[PDB]
Amino acid sequence: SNIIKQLEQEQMKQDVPSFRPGDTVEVKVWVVEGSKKRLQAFEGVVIAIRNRGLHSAFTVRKISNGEGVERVFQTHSPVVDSISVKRRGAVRKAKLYYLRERTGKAARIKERLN
Amino acid sequence: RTSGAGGQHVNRTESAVRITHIPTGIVTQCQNDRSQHKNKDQAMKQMKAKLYELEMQKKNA
Amino acid sequence: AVQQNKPTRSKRGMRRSHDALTAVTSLSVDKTSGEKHLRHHITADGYYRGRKVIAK
Amino acid sequence: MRHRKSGRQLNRNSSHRQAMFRNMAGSLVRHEIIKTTLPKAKELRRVVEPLITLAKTDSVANRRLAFARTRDNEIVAKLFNELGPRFASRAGGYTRILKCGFRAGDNAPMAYIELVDR
Amino acid sequence: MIGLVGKKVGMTRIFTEDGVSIPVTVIEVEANRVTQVKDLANDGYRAIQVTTGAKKANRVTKPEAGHFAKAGVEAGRGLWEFRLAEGEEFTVGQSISVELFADVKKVDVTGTSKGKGFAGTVKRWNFRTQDATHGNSLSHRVPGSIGQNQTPGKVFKGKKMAGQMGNERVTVQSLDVVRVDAERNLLLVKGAVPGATGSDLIVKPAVKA
Amino acid sequence: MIQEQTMLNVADNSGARRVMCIKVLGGSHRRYAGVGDIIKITIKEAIPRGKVKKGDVLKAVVVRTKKGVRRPDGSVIRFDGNACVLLNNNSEQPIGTRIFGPVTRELRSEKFMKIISLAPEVL
RNA sequence: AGGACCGAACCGACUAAUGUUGAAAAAUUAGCGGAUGACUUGUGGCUGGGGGUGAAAGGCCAAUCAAACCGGGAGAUAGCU
RNA sequence: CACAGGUGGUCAGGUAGAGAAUACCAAGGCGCUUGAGAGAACUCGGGUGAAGGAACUAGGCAAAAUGGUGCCGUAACUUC
RNA sequence: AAUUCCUUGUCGGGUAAGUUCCGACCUGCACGAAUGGCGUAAUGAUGGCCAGGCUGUCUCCACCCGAGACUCAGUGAAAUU
RNA sequence: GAUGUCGGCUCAUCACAUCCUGGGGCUGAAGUAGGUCCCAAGGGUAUGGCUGUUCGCCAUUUAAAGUGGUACGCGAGCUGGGUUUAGAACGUCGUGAGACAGUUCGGUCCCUAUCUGCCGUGGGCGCUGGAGAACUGAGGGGGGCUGCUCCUAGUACGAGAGGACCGGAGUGGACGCAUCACUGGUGUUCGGGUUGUCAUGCCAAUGGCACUGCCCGGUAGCUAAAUGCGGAAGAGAUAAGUGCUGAAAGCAUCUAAGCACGAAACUUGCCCCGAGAUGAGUUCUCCCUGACCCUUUAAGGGUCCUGAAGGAACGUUGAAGACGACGACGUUGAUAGGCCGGGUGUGUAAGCGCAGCGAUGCGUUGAGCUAACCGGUACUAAUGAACCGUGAGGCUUAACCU
């Protein structure tokens, strides 16, 4: 209700950039090893977005060192330091789950040139 | 219970006997007879024979 | 499964002790026609709460 | 369990329910008062009233949507030509339900459902 | 210490600055008014009766209305009792706010769990279903055997069978008190508490500790 | 989420290509092994001149799963295959000298420092 | 060409489930085998009981078969209940 | 039995289809002689299912899977 | 061995592990040459074993869609005692 | 004139002759690790290969993979591989029909629960005027498992190798309870793609049917694989055991008098049910303060008048629910629908314009549609009434006012 909505509004971030499924994004997240705290970049295609207010999330898929890796980021998590869109993709679905069966040329996504 | 037991009696009764020699690990087993006592006697005879044969194999070696 | 012994008329009546019907507590009287009807239902003349709802 | 669910199954499958409510909506629009069972009338509210809300605004897209919901041009025309203007000012609740006893054949609870301005 | 009566508002998450998401239950704990105080001389035990919320004037019956008027408090939506330790002392008409939990680390939350209705043995008691194939006849989720043969010739009391599940009083113990918001009458506890949204909860200081 | 009979790929250069989980170690009736868990494996396929032979029984540590791992903030990292790193039965130290593909932070322990150091990428 | 191949009608009946006071005194549903042949089917005929017929299972001979059914000997006999 | 059985012959539209298969229709005929609700367990008949993938079991039973046309290509063995 | 009691014979193969399977051996309880011996391509709703694929068979069940079960109106059995 | 049987499955329940965890004695017990006996039954006590198997062997685990009873528990719960009919064959016996605690391939597992029992859910009356709540707790049930790492400490011990007791912290396995914030499943009630065909006169746009025709997504709800929590600490009395003081028996002696320790067992402590606890308890509050007549004259029956508190019924309903029941609401109202706004999902509707020969693309456009969600809103339906429930509540004896 109003109470939970207020509790979530006071936690939501304010500078989340607009991105759509099919966009290539770079997400810089905080990695804490021992006592040193740095940023690690995860770059890949957004294949799913779950718009749920404070509970919003998005899935990014990349091919790292010959393996396919999907990471689901909570958008308003403090661990997600930054999100940037490196390339705008042109798809027609809200969930690009069919990319999991495609590799190389078959997995290419056309650029949304406007 | 013996294998291929036919009938209520045989299905229920524990007639097959297996004897294991703890020091050696050699095992004998008898289930030919209906009587557990006869099976145990035959298995004891086979166990005695096998221990003697083990000693005989050592002597032959 | 079936009974081993025939149940009695006593046990039959005991079981049927809860089978009694309940009469309608009271009937409502329409403010205009004066007809008795089930509460929250229209009357046999097509009236409800003093208003002729269904003609004929 | 059916926590927070909505919609009466009415001992039918989905396609039969949809067809029956399409026909019943057509009949209610045509005659402006019909006699059905109480559960069917209470479910018919949620089908018919959105049709009138759709008819409130007259456009080609809305007419095609109303045809898709109720495949009869007579019902579509009556909606958009009379019931929209009739119920323009009314917020909702274009229908009322009057319980009317029990059906003789099977003791089913019966109700009239009618348009409120009839 | 005594507890308070609240309402289950829902579930949220709290993001800590070190990147940890804490699942929280939000309990709206408005002021609880003391409607009666019980003592050894008159009742034989020491406890306070409290009420909370508001109620319809035309739905408060005259006995309830008189009971509230003797205390001098507005009619709440119910009455609950809390036993008193020998140090605690309250007075009739006194109001207690969620500030009582300001220095409490863990709480026990009691509520009426969600009702599942008539539940089978598989759901209710985690019985294992029998084989779905391999010749099984009409016995896929049935209990199985329910006793031994002629001895004892009966089914033992407390046998696990199908029946009503849920809709009963359930207490979850030792939940962390994430936040006490006095101005919004909010108690954010870590984890899940029994009951659906809008149900009454009883929050006490943790008895285990 | 690895159990018995699960086939896994090998993320090192020990010579094995496919292994099968035959036991999830570390408890009675234990069902699954996630990332950072030790399992007992048999080797189903190996390269001709590897350090291990087909049919060998040894240990392994699961480094990638399709079920994935969950981070404290609710995030989840998933991979496209189940992959493990082979280990001696006794020392439980890695057999190979190279680690292939990324691993996760869940191996950041004194037990698997060799794997962490040799991994191309840690997530 | 083919006791050839695939596959409907057609003839069958290998598996499972359901049914078992059944919708049915042998079936339904999903599959299954043959489907120009030693095939299948309509109408009519012939073989009769220690007899028929049987690519043979003691199978079939009107829901009856190591000897059909009906009537008779007959109130067989029953140291048995 | 107003019984999900059995019962020989004749007729043979459209679209797709090799087809008398199959899907949807025509001519024509029917909604199957108890209904109304509800939306528990459990039974039946289906749909989908994370990770695993025969570990199930007497047994891969059941289910899942394969499935067309054209072309490329096709092993041991063989009575060719 | 559709034949072997002892017997889960022994050795080899396959499996992490194989009373089953496959190859041998010969100590054939109790094979053997038209109540045929040993082979054998093709065939088989034939028996056993193995693999890939596939999967709710299973870890371990969850949800959903229908027909019953439940309530109301009408009609209205049965075994058993 | 019928008590169905091996193994498996599902579900168990008890014994202790204890497998693990707990406590102890002795040790040919340095430590670690054992051996053996005593106490202890609270909890726990594998998955696979082979076989119909029980058993057993084997592989790999575990703190451990206990031994038993229960019609060798459990087929009106399931299975039907073994066994156990009718077919067939091998070996063997017989001249043969046939036979084999020889083998081999195939081969119908019915029952709508009357009673007891058990799991849940109601109705009636009672509890002594009626009613609405909150309790108390007699009693009953649940739960009770354990690994590994680190500190103590490389300390005690030991020649070394190795390596503690006691105490403390962390993190797991299995199990259980709750919940859906997350991660997921489902989502035939939301959006879209698409195949065949039919129809809406046709085009365009839709609808029907083909398992939701096939698919791709997905709200709410439910849910696990998801994530919170739990087992305890403490107390009392003890078991085996250890003692102090202490005679009988000038010594000795844990015992005879007296006194102290002592375990996952017992009683509590934790959670739940619980006054039909007929021994029906307690507390708070609310309501009812008329007349008359008879009899067999009393805890009697009428007559009129009166009808309270409250309840029930009816209706709108609910994360409540088989039906009951329980909860919310009934105009002095947000109970349900609708409506409005938002959100969510789908993914840029239609129509029109432009480009293209055309399929199609682009613009209008993140457009259109959007279930169960959230916040509002009396537009619709929750009707005035009526119904049940009474009129001051027995006797005896005390205490107090009187």
Ligand SMILES: [K+]
């Ligand atoms: K009728």
Ligand SMILES: [K+]
């Ligand atoms: K004859």
Ligand SMILES: [K+]
């Ligand atoms: K058709």
Ligand SMILES: [K+]
């Ligand atoms: K032989």
Ligand SMILES: [K+]
């Ligand atoms: K011959």
Ligand SMILES: [K+]
């Ligand atoms: K020959």
Ligand SMILES: [K+]
């Ligand atoms: K074969």
Ligand SMILES: [K+]
């Ligand atoms: K012990």
Ligand SMILES: [K+]
């Ligand atoms: K000892």
Ligand SMILES: [K+]
């Ligand atoms: K015990």
Ligand SMILES: [K+]
């Ligand atoms: K055996």
Ligand SMILES: [K+]
């Ligand atoms: K037992």
Ligand SMILES: [K+]
């Ligand atoms: K028995």
Ligand SMILES: [K+]
């Ligand atoms: K019985």
Ligand SMILES: [K+]
């Ligand atoms: K009885």
Ligand SMILES: [K+]
């Ligand atoms: K969820």
